[PDB]
Write a protein that holds these residues in place. Structure first.
Motif, PDB file in Angstrom:
ATOM      1  N   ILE A  88       7.899 -33.765 -36.927  1.00 56.03           N
ATOM      2  CA  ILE A  88       8.720 -33.819 -38.127  1.00 56.03           C
ATOM      3  C   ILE A  88       8.125 -34.766 -39.162  1.00 56.03           C
ATOM      4  CG2 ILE A  88      11.081 -34.019 -38.970  1.00 56.03           C
ATOM      5  CD1 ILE A  88      12.106 -33.827 -36.222  1.00 56.03           C
ATOM      6  N   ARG A  89       8.496 -34.563 -40.421  1.00 53.94           N
ATOM      7  CA  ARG A  89       8.001 -35.398 -41.511  1.00 53.94           C
ATOM      8  C   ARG A  89       9.154 -36.085 -42.236  1.00 53.94           C
ATOM      9  NH1 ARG A  89       2.874 -35.195 -44.616  1.00 53.94           N
ATOM     10  NH2 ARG A  89       3.920 -33.902 -46.196  1.00 53.94           N
ATOM     11  N   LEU A  90      10.344 -36.010 -41.649  1.00 57.30           N
ATOM     12  CA  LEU A  90      11.528 -36.626 -42.239  1.00 57.30           C
ATOM     13  C   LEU A  90      11.785 -36.080 -43.639  1.00 57.30           C
ATOM     14  CD1 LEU A  90      13.774 -38.601 -42.826  1.00 57.30           C
ATOM     15  CD2 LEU A  90      12.971 -38.741 -40.462  1.00 57.30           C
ATOM     16  N   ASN A  91      11.673 -34.763 -43.785  1.00 54.52           N
ATOM     17  CA  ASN A  91      11.893 -34.115 -45.073  1.00 54.52           C
ATOM     18  C   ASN A  91      11.983 -32.602 -44.914  1.00 54.52           C
ATOM     19  OD1 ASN A  91      10.485 -32.964 -47.882  1.00 54.52           O
ATOM     20  ND2 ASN A  91      11.901 -34.683 -48.173  1.00 54.52           N
ATOM     21  N   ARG A  92      13.118 -32.130 -44.408  1.00 58.02           N
ATOM     22  CA  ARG A  92      13.331 -30.704 -44.203  1.00 58.02           C
ATOM     23  C   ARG A  92      13.397 -29.964 -45.535  1.00 58.02           C
ATOM     24  NH1 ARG A  92      18.314 -30.610 -42.212  1.00 58.02           N
ATOM     25  NH2 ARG A  92      18.843 -31.710 -40.270  1.00 58.02           N
ATOM     26  N   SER A  93      13.377 -30.717 -46.630  1.00 59.09           N
ATOM     27  CA  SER A  93      13.436 -30.130 -47.964  1.00 59.09           C
ATOM     28  C   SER A  93      12.111 -29.467 -48.331  1.00 59.09           C
ATOM     29  CB  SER A  93      13.790 -31.199 -48.998  1.00 59.09           C
ATOM     30  OG  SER A  93      12.842 -32.252 -48.990  1.00 59.09           O
ATOM     31  N   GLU A  94      11.230 -29.325 -47.347  1.00 61.66           N
ATOM     32  CA  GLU A  94       9.930 -28.707 -47.568  1.00 61.66           C
ATOM     33  C   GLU A  94      10.067 -27.193 -47.697  1.00 61.66           C
ATOM     34  OE1 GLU A  94       7.173 -30.541 -48.470  1.00 61.66           O
ATOM     35  OE2 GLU A  94       6.094 -30.713 -46.563  1.00 61.66           O
ATOM     36  N   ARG A  95       8.951 -26.518 -47.955  1.00 62.38           N
ATOM     37  CA  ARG A  95       8.958 -25.067 -48.100  1.00 62.38           C
ATOM     38  C   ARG A  95       7.853 -24.422 -47.272  1.00 62.38           C
ATOM     39  NH1 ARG A  95      11.128 -23.204 -53.894  1.00 62.38           N
ATOM     40  NH2 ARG A  95       9.528 -24.291 -55.128  1.00 62.38           N
ATOM     41  N   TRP A  96       8.260 -23.665 -46.260  1.00 61.50           N
ATOM     42  CA  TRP A  96       7.322 -22.975 -45.378  1.00 61.50           C
ATOM     43  C   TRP A  96       7.965 -21.713 -44.810  1.00 61.50           C
ATOM     44  CZ3 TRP A  96       3.403 -26.023 -46.488  1.00 61.50           C
ATOM     45  CH2 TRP A  96       3.618 -27.399 -46.638  1.00 61.50           C
ATOM     46  N   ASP A  97       7.501 -21.295 -43.638  1.00 56.98           N
ATOM     47  CA  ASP A  97       8.041 -20.111 -42.983  1.00 56.98           C
ATOM     48  C   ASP A  97       9.088 -20.507 -41.949  1.00 56.98           C
ATOM     49  OD1 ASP A  97       5.185 -20.093 -43.738  1.00 56.98           O
ATOM     50  OD2 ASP A  97       4.862 -20.227 -41.568  1.00 56.98           O
ATOM     51  N   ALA A  98       9.537 -19.537 -41.163  1.00 55.06           N
ATOM     52  CA  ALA A  98      10.542 -19.794 -40.140  1.00 55.06           C
ATOM     53  C   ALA A  98      10.294 -18.956 -38.890  1.00 55.06           C
ATOM     54  CB  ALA A  98      11.930 -19.511 -40.693  1.00 55.06           C
ATOM     55  N   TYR A  99      10.074 -19.628 -37.763  1.00 50.98           N
ATOM     56  CA  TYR A  99       9.838 -18.942 -36.500  1.00 50.98           C
ATOM     57  C   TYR A  99      11.162 -18.631 -35.811  1.00 50.98           C
ATOM     58  CZ  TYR A  99       4.791 -19.783 -36.603  1.00 50.98           C
ATOM     59  OH  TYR A  99       3.454 -19.780 -36.929  1.00 50.98           O
ATOM     60  N   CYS A 100      11.458 -17.346 -35.649  1.00 51.82           N
ATOM     61  CA  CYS A 100      12.699 -16.925 -35.010  1.00 51.82           C
ATOM     62  C   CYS A 100      12.500 -16.694 -33.517  1.00 51.82           C
ATOM     63  CB  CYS A 100      13.228 -15.648 -35.669  1.00 51.82           C
ATOM     64  SG  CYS A 100      14.429 -15.940 -37.008  1.00 51.82           S
ATOM     65  N   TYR A 101      13.586 -16.810 -32.758  1.00 54.64           N
ATOM     66  CA  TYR A 101      13.542 -16.611 -31.316  1.00 54.64           C
ATOM     67  C   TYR A 101      14.900 -16.161 -30.796  1.00 54.64           C
ATOM     68  CZ  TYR A 101      12.566 -17.410 -26.376  1.00 54.64           C
ATOM     69  OH  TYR A 101      12.387 -17.254 -25.021  1.00 54.64           O
ATOM     70  N   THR A 122      10.274 -22.782 -30.776  1.00 60.03           N
ATOM     71  CA  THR A 122       9.688 -24.100 -30.554  1.00 60.03           C
ATOM     72  C   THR A 122       8.176 -24.020 -30.403  1.00 60.03           C
ATOM     73  OG1 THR A 122       9.828 -24.082 -28.124  1.00 60.03           O
ATOM     74  CG2 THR A 122      11.786 -24.792 -29.347  1.00 60.03           C
ATOM     75  N   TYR A 123       7.578 -25.138 -30.014  1.00 59.29           N
ATOM     76  CA  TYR A 123       6.137 -25.206 -29.814  1.00 59.29           C
ATOM     77  C   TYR A 123       5.743 -24.414 -28.579  1.00 59.29           C
ATOM     78  CZ  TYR A 123       1.561 -27.132 -28.570  1.00 59.29           C
ATOM     79  OH  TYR A 123       0.239 -27.283 -28.220  1.00 59.29           O
ATOM     80  N   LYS A 124       6.149 -24.922 -27.424  1.00 68.35           N
ATOM     81  CA  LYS A 124       5.853 -24.274 -26.154  1.00 68.35           C
ATOM     82  C   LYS A 124       6.213 -22.794 -26.207  1.00 68.35           C
ATOM     83  CE  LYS A 124       5.572 -27.988 -23.055  1.00 68.35           C
ATOM     84  NZ  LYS A 124       6.349 -27.700 -21.819  1.00 68.35           N
ATOM     85  N   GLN A 125       7.315 -22.477 -26.882  1.00 66.59           N
ATOM     86  CA  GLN A 125       7.755 -21.099 -27.009  1.00 66.59           C
ATOM     87  C   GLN A 125       6.777 -20.310 -27.865  1.00 66.59           C
ATOM     88  OE1 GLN A 125      11.779 -21.120 -28.478  1.00 66.59           O
ATOM     89  NE2 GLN A 125      12.636 -21.849 -26.535  1.00 66.59           N
ATOM     90  N   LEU A 126       6.559 -20.780 -29.087  1.00 63.62           N
ATOM     91  CA  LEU A 126       5.628 -20.125 -29.992  1.00 63.62           C
ATOM     92  C   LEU A 126       4.246 -20.078 -29.356  1.00 63.62           C
ATOM     93  CD1 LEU A 126       3.615 -19.862 -32.545  1.00 63.62           C
ATOM     94  CD2 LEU A 126       5.797 -18.644 -32.492  1.00 63.62           C
ATOM     95  N   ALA A 164      11.418 -26.660 -33.458  1.00 67.05           N
ATOM     96  CA  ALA A 164      12.016 -27.852 -32.871  1.00 67.05           C
ATOM     97  C   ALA A 164      13.185 -28.363 -33.706  1.00 67.05           C
ATOM     98  CB  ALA A 164      10.963 -28.934 -32.712  1.00 67.05           C
ATOM     99  N   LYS A 165      13.596 -29.594 -33.427  1.00 68.87           N
ATOM    100  CA  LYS A 165      14.710 -30.215 -34.136  1.00 68.87           C
ATOM    101  C   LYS A 165      14.402 -30.389 -35.621  1.00 68.87           C
ATOM    102  CE  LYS A 165      16.687 -31.989 -30.482  1.00 68.87           C
ATOM    103  NZ  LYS A 165      17.935 -31.182 -30.394  1.00 68.87           N
ATOM    104  N   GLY A 166      13.155 -30.138 -36.006  1.00 70.21           N
ATOM    105  CA  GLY A 166      12.774 -30.279 -37.399  1.00 70.21           C
ATOM    106  C   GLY A 166      11.276 -30.430 -37.566  1.00 70.21           C
ATOM    107  N   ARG A 167      10.521 -30.042 -36.543  1.00 70.94           N
ATOM    108  CA  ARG A 167       9.069 -30.138 -36.593  1.00 70.94           C
ATOM    109  C   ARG A 167       8.458 -28.814 -37.042  1.00 70.94           C
ATOM    110  NH1 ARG A 167       6.773 -30.757 -30.517  1.00 70.94           N
ATOM    111  NH2 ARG A 167       8.876 -31.637 -30.249  1.00 70.94           N
ATOM    112  N   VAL A 168       7.533 -28.886 -37.991  1.00 75.87           N
ATOM    113  CA  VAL A 168       6.874 -27.693 -38.507  1.00 75.87           C
ATOM    114  C   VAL A 168       5.363 -27.775 -38.313  1.00 75.87           C
ATOM    115  CG1 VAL A 168       7.574 -28.798 -40.661  1.00 75.87           C
ATOM    116  CG2 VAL A 168       6.008 -26.845 -40.722  1.00 75.87           C
ATOM    117  N   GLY A 169       4.813 -26.808 -37.587  1.00 81.32           N
ATOM    118  CA  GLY A 169       3.383 -26.790 -37.337  1.00 81.32           C
ATOM    119  C   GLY A 169       2.708 -25.571 -37.933  1.00 81.32           C
TER     120      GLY A 169
END
Length: 98
Positions: free
Chosen positions: A80-93, A32-36, A53-58
């Motif tokens: 979120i941008r209401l479009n998870r069909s985007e392409r980026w990275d992934a923060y694991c935890y 998440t944000y606070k986590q990252l 988050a539930k679908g937020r990408v920063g």
């Protein structure tokens, strides 16, 4: 336990759905944000939109780049941008991520 993650094909190719599947794949959980953040303050820097988050990408940046972040401070998340069909990275935890 936060760690940056990319796609098997390369950065900017993972969708909130894919990004998660990978993290949750090994009993992990998206970062998440606070986590990252708490991890970013320790050295967690990754010039690239990282799902969270539930679908937020920063774009968490602890070191204001000259051409990368153009000089951004902290995590640059707009929500979120209401479009998870985007392409980026992934923060694991994962507590152990082993």
């Amino acid at each position: 336990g936060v760690y940056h993650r990319e796609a098997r094909s390369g950065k900017y190719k993972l969708t909130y759905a894919e990004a998660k599947a990978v993290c949750e794949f090994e009993g992990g959980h998206l970062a998440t944000y606070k986590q990252l953040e708490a991890a970013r303050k320790i050295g967690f820097h990754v010039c690239a939109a990282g799902w969270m988050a539930k679908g937020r990408v920063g774009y968490p940046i602890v070191k204001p780049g000259p051409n990368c972040g153009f000089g951004k401070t902290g995590i640059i998340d707009y929500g979120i941008r209401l479009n998870r069909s985007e392409r980026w990275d992934a923060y694991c935890y994962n507590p152990h991520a082993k």
